[PDB]
Amino acid sequence: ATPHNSAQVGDFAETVLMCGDPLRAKLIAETYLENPKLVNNVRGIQGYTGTYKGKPISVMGHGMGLPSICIYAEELYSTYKVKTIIRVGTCGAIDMDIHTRDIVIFTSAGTNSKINRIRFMDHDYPATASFDVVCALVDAAKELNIPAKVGKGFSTDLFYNPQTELAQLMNKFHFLAVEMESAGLFPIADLYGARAGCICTVSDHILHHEETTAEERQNSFQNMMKIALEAAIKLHHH
Amino acid sequence: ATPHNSAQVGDFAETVLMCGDPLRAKLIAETYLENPKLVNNVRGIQGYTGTYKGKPISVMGHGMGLPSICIYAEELYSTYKVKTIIRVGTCGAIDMDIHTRDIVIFTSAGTNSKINRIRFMDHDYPATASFDVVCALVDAAKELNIPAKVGKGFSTDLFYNPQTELAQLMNKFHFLAVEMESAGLFPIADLYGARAGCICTVSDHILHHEETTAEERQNSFQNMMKIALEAAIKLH
Amino acid sequence: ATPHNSAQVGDFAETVLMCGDPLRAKLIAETYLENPKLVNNVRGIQGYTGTYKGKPISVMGHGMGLPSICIYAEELYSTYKVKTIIRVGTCGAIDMDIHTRDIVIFTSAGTNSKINRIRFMDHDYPATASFDVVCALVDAAKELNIPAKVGKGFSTDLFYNPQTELAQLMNKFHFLAVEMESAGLFPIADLYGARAGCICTVSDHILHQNSFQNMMKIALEAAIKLH
Amino acid sequence: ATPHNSAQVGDFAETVLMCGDPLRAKLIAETYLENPKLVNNVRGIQGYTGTYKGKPISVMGHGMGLPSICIYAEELYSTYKVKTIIRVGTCGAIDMDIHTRDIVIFTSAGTNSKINRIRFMDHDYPATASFDVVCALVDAAKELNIPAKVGKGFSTDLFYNPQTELAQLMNKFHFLAVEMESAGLFPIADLYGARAGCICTVSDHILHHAEERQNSFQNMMKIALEAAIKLHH
Amino acid sequence: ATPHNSAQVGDFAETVLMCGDPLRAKLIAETYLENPKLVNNVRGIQGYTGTYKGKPISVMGHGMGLPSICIYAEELYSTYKVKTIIRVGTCGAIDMDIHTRDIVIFTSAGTNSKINRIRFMDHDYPATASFDVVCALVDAAKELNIPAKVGKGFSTDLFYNPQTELAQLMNKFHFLAVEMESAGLFPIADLYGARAGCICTVSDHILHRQNSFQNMMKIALEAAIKLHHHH
Amino acid sequence: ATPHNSAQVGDFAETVLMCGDPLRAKLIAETYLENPKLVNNVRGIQGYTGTYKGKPISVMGHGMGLPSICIYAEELYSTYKVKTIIRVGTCGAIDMDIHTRDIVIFTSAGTNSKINRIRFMDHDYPATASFDVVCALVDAAKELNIPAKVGKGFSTDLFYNPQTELAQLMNKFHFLAVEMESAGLFPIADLYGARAGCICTVSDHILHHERQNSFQNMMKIALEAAIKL
Numbered sequence A: 001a002t003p004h005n006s007a008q009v010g011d012f013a014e015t016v017l018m019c020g021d022p023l024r025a026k027l028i029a030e031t032y033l034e035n036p037k038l039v040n041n042v043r044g045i046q047g048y049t050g051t052y053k054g055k056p057i058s059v060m061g062h063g064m065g066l067p068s069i070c071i072y073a074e075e076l077y078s079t080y081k082v083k084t085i086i087r088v089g090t091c092g093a094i095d096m097d098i099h100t101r102d103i104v105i106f107t108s109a110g111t112n113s114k115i116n117r118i119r120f121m122d123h124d125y126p127a128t129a130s131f132d133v134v135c136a137l138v139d140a141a142k143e144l145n146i147p148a149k150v151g152k153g154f155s156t157d158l159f160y161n162p163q164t165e166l167a168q169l170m171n172k173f174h175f176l177a178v179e180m181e182s183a184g185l186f187p188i189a190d191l192y193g194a195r196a197g198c199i200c201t202v203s204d205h206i207l208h209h210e211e212t213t214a215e216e217r218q219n220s221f222q223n224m225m226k227i228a229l230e231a232a233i234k235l236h237h238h
Numbered sequence B: 001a002t003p004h005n006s007a008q009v010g011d012f013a014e015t016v017l018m019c020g021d022p023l024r025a026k027l028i029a030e031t032y033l034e035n036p037k038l039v040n041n042v043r044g045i046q047g048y049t050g051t052y053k054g055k056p057i058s059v060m061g062h063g064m065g066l067p068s069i070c071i072y073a074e075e076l077y078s079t080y081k082v083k084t085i086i087r088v089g090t091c092g093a094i095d096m097d098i099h100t101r102d103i104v105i106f107t108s109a110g111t112n113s114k115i116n117r118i119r120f121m122d123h124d125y126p127a128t129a130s131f132d133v134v135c136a137l138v139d140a141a142k143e144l145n146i147p148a149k150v151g152k153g154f155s156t157d158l159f160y161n162p163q164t165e166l167a168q169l170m171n172k173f174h175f176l177a178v179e180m181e182s183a184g185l186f187p188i189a190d191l192y193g194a195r196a197g198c199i200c201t202v203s204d205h206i207l208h209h210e211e212t213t214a215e216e217r218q219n220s221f222q223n224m225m226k227i228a229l230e231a232a233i234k235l236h
Numbered sequence C: 001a002t003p004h005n006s007a008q009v010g011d012f013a014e015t016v017l018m019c020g021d022p023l024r025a026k027l028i029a030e031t032y033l034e035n036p037k038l039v040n041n042v043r044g045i046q047g048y049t050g051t052y053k054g055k056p057i058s059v060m061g062h063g064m065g066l067p068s069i070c071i072y073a074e075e076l077y078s079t080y081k082v083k084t085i086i087r088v089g090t091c092g093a094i095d096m097d098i099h100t101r102d103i104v105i106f107t108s109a110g111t112n113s114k115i116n117r118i119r120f121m122d123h124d125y126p127a128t129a130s131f132d133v134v135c136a137l138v139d140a141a142k143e144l145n146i147p148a149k150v151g152k153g154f155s156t157d158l159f160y161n162p163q164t165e166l167a168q169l170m171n172k173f174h175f176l177a178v179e180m181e182s183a184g185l186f187p188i189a190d191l192y193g194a195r196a197g198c199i200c201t202v203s204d205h206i207l208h209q210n211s212f213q214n215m216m217k218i219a220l221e222a223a224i225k226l227h
Numbered sequence D: 001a002t003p004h005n006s007a008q009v010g011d012f013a014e015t016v017l018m019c020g021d022p023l024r025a026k027l028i029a030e031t032y033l034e035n036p037k038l039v040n041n042v043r044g045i046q047g048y049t050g051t052y053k054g055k056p057i058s059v060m061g062h063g064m065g066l067p068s069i070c071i072y073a074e075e076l077y078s079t080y081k082v083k084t085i086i087r088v089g090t091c092g093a094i095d096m097d098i099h100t101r102d103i104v105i106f107t108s109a110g111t112n113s114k115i116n117r118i119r120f121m122d123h124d125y126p127a128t129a130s131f132d133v134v135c136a137l138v139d140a141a142k143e144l145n146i147p148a149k150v151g152k153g154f155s156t157d158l159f160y161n162p163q164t165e166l167a168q169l170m171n172k173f174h175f176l177a178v179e180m181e182s183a184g185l186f187p188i189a190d191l192y193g194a195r196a197g198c199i200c201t202v203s204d205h206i207l208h209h210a211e212e213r214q215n216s217f218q219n220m221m222k223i224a225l226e227a228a229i230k231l232h233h
Numbered sequence E: 001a002t003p004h005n006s007a008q009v010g011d012f013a014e015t016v017l018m019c020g021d022p023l024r025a026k027l028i029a030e031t032y033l034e035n036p037k038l039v040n041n042v043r044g045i046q047g048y049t050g051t052y053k054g055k056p057i058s059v060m061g062h063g064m065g066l067p068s069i070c071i072y073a074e075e076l077y078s079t080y081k082v083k084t085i086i087r088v089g090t091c092g093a094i095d096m097d098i099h100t101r102d103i104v105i106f107t108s109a110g111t112n113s114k115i116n117r118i119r120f121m122d123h124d125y126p127a128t129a130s131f132d133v134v135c136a137l138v139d140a141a142k143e144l145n146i147p148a149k150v151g152k153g154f155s156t157d158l159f160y161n162p163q164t165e166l167a168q169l170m171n172k173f174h175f176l177a178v179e180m181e182s183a184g185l186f187p188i189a190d191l192y193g194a195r196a197g198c199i200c201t202v203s204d205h206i207l208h209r210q211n212s213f214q215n216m217m218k219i220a221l222e223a224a225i226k227l228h229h230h231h
Numbered sequence F: 001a002t003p004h005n006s007a008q009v010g011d012f013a014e015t016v017l018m019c020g021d022p023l024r025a026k027l028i029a030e031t032y033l034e035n036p037k038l039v040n041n042v043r044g045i046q047g048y049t050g051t052y053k054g055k056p057i058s059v060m061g062h063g064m065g066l067p068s069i070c071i072y073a074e075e076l077y078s079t080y081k082v083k084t085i086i087r088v089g090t091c092g093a094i095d096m097d098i099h100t101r102d103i104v105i106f107t108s109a110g111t112n113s114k115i116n117r118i119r120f121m122d123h124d125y126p127a128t129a130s131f132d133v134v135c136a137l138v139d140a141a142k143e144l145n146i147p148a149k150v151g152k153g154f155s156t157d158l159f160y161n162p163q164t165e166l167a168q169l170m171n172k173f174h175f176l177a178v179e180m181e182s183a184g185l186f187p188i189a190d191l192y193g194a195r196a197g198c199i200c201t202v203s204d205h206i207l208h209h210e211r212q213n214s215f216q217n218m219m220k221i222a223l224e225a226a227i228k229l
């Protein structure tokens, strides 16, 4: 029904977990959902709908980077009447106390893209996560006794950033981590009167080269997924 | 000890409430604080320190506009070793459902100022309220049975905005209200690894003319004031 | 009559002197104006109207910063029918040559604010002092034998400037001094077909009564000249 | 050996065709190459290496949008020593005489992204296709007798573009077609001394209104593949 | 000695009048200067040096546009050690009451060019005429009884302006007239601790060579005499 | 017919060669054109129209910098119904391999001007030479066995560039040369559904600091290209 989505109105739960890597979405469905149906596989994006603790949930990839999340998120919010998108991703740490495997929940997301300036008369849009979503995520992590840090992210357009000075600027202002998606997501939810959040697990540090193995990874990705899901259950009221 | 402040390190409590109107800072001090002391009156700014329910609090004006609050906020965080500034202000409603006398708590603030671009290599800084402060403010509002709305603010450099289409664009995106300070406060607190938040009472609507003829005013200021004072305690 | 001004049309004279410190404002009124009256104290801003050598003059605070002066200037030119604003302030010297207590007349003011670009389709607006005013101020100083430099100012949004290299660059281009207001004032005066100028006394160097009175005398004399 | 790419140096050929759709990637490998090995499937991206009419060729997805292609392309030119990339995607037509099924070769691409201004001191970078590639793409289209239009493209950050007056502005300036990638790619080619180009098939008109596709996309593919052969020598 | 100027240090006077039409520079030389000599004609730019009432003066073309004038102004002030440049051009009128062949003296110049942003860390540089020069032009006009308006100009990069709304905006803020040079000129003078100004005869109205041109030239030349005396 | 051009419609050929120096326009018309008539000398601009190998070709100065060429170019495409403009100029080399008296043909040109952002909703316009024209100039140079380099140029607003680090930046991206005109030219051509191109002779080097015989090579190529059109 869209160029990027073969599903119809109703095929998506009104809460969707989203991540960059479509194989992670497949994994989330195969691992945590009851009765998962493939609802969208246009461009291999792996969108599934099922339940978690009896409540309807959906999981899908959004591809890497703001332009990509901006396509999917808009479609979900407008065509498929989705109410909440929680991005579950990875990130690169900025703060010196945050390490690999750590978990981060974003209040907001800076960016170097021009997308919001196009949306917002060339002024400063504050890409902000839904207050609710943050709470839900913070409480889920507490209840699950998993430590989670709370603060600003940065959505870069350039994984390989030629501005080498930028990391330390972000560390001066106590940014927590870098990903490529959240600043595209937050204003879009605002635009549709809907809600959005972002929770991330740290995959590498950008201010030193760390130790990440070839599998773990998974163990901390698992916690993030668990928090996301419990939080998703709290949102649903109403 | 600064060009804008005749107090010495220690003269301010570690938590400070600020507002545009220095006469408002006077009122807060003369009304709510116990044993208040004038600690700074350079340029008639009205800086006071006392305690609230026995807890050290300070209050001071911050002028109108990002430049002004940027001077005072930085000085306070820097020289005076302040950990938390809550801005207690007024604002112009954007959202059709927020009405005069309603109380707004900001999660963050957008802006048309250039200050954060200057601070941040020409990129997009999200001026964000400190999560702890938003919580405290929301909790205190609940506790006191005062309805309070949570969301985005816009800090304008231009009260009389020659961009007439912008009011509606802000409304398209569900901005709650407009003031002139928060977008400059929030990053400064980050800089010093301190905390900041903004609570506001609605004094006008920028999308029609509404309830200016009302006497809250003080009954709505008072509510905001008490939410702010109570939140301040809860951050100590 | 405005959210920033309890006064009525006519409560202000056609000429207003403005400064950042409202405590300075009241001192000015008291020190120079016959029968001065408080005409606005919304936000402790201290606006007074009286006369000077028989001629009507107002004085009021404008707060620090472009957004603040923009509020007050527009209202005075708009609602209050003010014809001429002269900012009588302080400034941070830039030029290697300029010294603490020196008097500076701005011909224009550059800026790092975005306000002018928002007013002017994102192009470079030259915030220029009214030429008539610069004349009145320079002649005044000549007749009074007060030395006064004439040139560019820079209105900054960031008193504590994270751009540490900007001071040398302003020196390189012979900017005379830094304040935080003029660049906002001048474009507004043009907008209303009115006049504006700024005169400063140096208080500090960003690189390396006496003057206060001289500045006041200069401004007040110039105000007579522009009738 | 990169976080987006499990392959080692040499696993990719010197010439790499790229598209947005990693399923279209897979399909090209299966359809056009002999003995296609899968060399990278990190994030489902479908990187294949085989040969076509003898010479070595690779094919991989690049996701949608500048930030995505910038990741892959840099990695390809940098780690995997790739010499030539030809993007073989789709596009939204702008010009009034460009229709669905029609095939466009881009000389350059403009953009509303800020990427290039970040690379190029906040000035204007002309994201230009490599002169070789464009010739080759055109030469091939003549040889294979395929009608192909040459000119400017536009790479957008914003598929659902809130600036609705931009489409006509691009018509005014005779921009052929919109996609989301070339503006990112080309400057990177430049940066590593390498070469890039773009051929696209029209999937929609942005100024008005499943099987060709397998005719015009079929045609596009032949032009690209034949051009690749001319370039690897 | 420069890529755009065959002359050597000393060949130009400390005061130089510049216009954009090189054919005009030749006429000015003939019409006003005693013993004018060709000093530079790289690119047909018609550079001349003579005296006017016994005080040394030069006149050169500067071509149209900010990039051109920036080249010529920087060379004069650095290589040729010029102290004062006065642009004596034409301009299209903006203000409703400024009419064809009126005389405008610019206090400053707005611009749609990025040049001053590039020079000044992407902030607002106010391309301001040197106060002395402005004063010398004003006084001269009063001395000669020539009415002359005073206020801001705008230097465009786009003679044919695709931003059709821009003229009316400029009118809103009381810009007097448009040219294509002064915004380049002013900041360069400042860079070299020198002086610049611009005087303009209105040739057209964007909203709605012996008389006005003669008058502009006298004011520019009489002002050139006042400057030089201090210093 | 215009503030800068005295000629009427018909006076210019469909193809015009344009340079910065009017003394070169003059020297080109005298040398390569048969029966050159001076069609426009407003502001000393030196506009001629003749024939070459039996075909109408004009030649005119365009001044220095984008603002100037943007006036002339838009008048020629607009009032004079010109179809093709080939700029034949000088340029300072950027790439460490390119040298004095080399001949660069521009595919496209970057700029530090604001002119294209004004024209283009504050986005990035690729000032691209017309593909036909680049072919023609490339083909013509084979024929005459003259080495021609092909790629990106850069039009600066500032000959004396206070951005001292820019030169290397351009080298890091293998920009061949800097001039001051092509970035203005190309989008006007597009705007008028017309064609433009640009070819230069290298007069200086901006990173590691005749005329004639390289200028002849340049002139021959451009004229030869003009024929193929």
Ligand SMILES: Nc1ncnc2c(CN3C[C@H](CO)[C@@H](O)C3)c[nH]c12
Residues within 6 Å of the ligand: A020, A063, A064, A065, A089, A090, A091, A092, A156, A158, A159, A178, A179, A180, A181, A203, A204, A206, D003
């Ligand atoms: N170093 C670094 N930079 C930017 N982003 C990330 C991320 C987060 N996501 C990974 C994907 C790109 O590798 C993109 O979706 C953001 C992990 N480490 C990162």
Ligand SMILES: Nc1ncnc2c(CN3C[C@H](CO)[C@@H](O)C3)c[nH]c12
Residues within 6 Å of the ligand: B020, B063, B064, B065, B089, B090, B091, B092, B156, B158, B159, B178, B179, B180, B181, B203, B204, B206, C003
């Ligand atoms: N309409 C409108 N615009 C900008 N700001 C405000 C405010 C908040 N503050 C009041 C002061 C200006 O009136 C300034 O401190 C912002 C209330 N209504 C406003």
Ligand SMILES: Nc1ncnc2c(CN3C[C@H](CO)[C@@H](O)C3)c[nH]c12
Residues within 6 Å of the ligand: B003, C020, C063, C064, C065, C089, C090, C091, C092, C093, C156, C159, C178, C179, C180, C181, C203, C204, C206
């Ligand atoms: N160093 C420095 N920077 C910016 N401005 C000033 C001023 C002028 N006014 C003083 C107020 C702040 O100290 C501000 O309104 C401008 C004096 N020294 C200054």
Ligand SMILES: Nc1ncnc2c(CN3C[C@H](CO)[C@@H](O)C3)c[nH]c12
Residues within 6 Å of the ligand: A003, D020, D063, D064, D065, D089, D090, D091, D092, D156, D159, D178, D179, D180, D181, D203, D204, D206
């Ligand atoms: N209308 C429109 N806009 C932007 N791009 C395209 C494309 C080309 N690609 C398809 C993907 C978006 O659907 C993106 O990778 C570019 C076809 N039609 C498009």
Ligand SMILES: Nc1ncnc2c(CN3C[C@H](CO)[C@@H](O)C3)c[nH]c12
Residues within 6 Å of the ligand: E020, E063, E064, E065, E089, E090, E091, E092, E156, E159, E178, E179, E180, E181, E203, E204, E206, F003, F004
């Ligand atoms: N309408 C209009 N626009 C921009 N500039 C001018 C000028 C001033 N000079 C004329 C030259 C262009 O014709 C240029 O050098 C500036 C006169 N009328 C003008």
Ligand SMILES: Nc1ncnc2c(CN3C[C@H](CO)[C@@H](O)C3)c[nH]c12
Residues within 6 Å of the ligand: E003, F020, F063, F064, F065, F089, F090, F091, F092, F156, F158, F159, F178, F179, F180, F181, F203, F204, F206
């Ligand atoms: N170093 C350098 N910078 C900018 N441009 C050029 C040119 C090319 N043209 C010569 C004229 C400036 O001297 C201008 O038309 C561009 C040769 N060398 C140049």
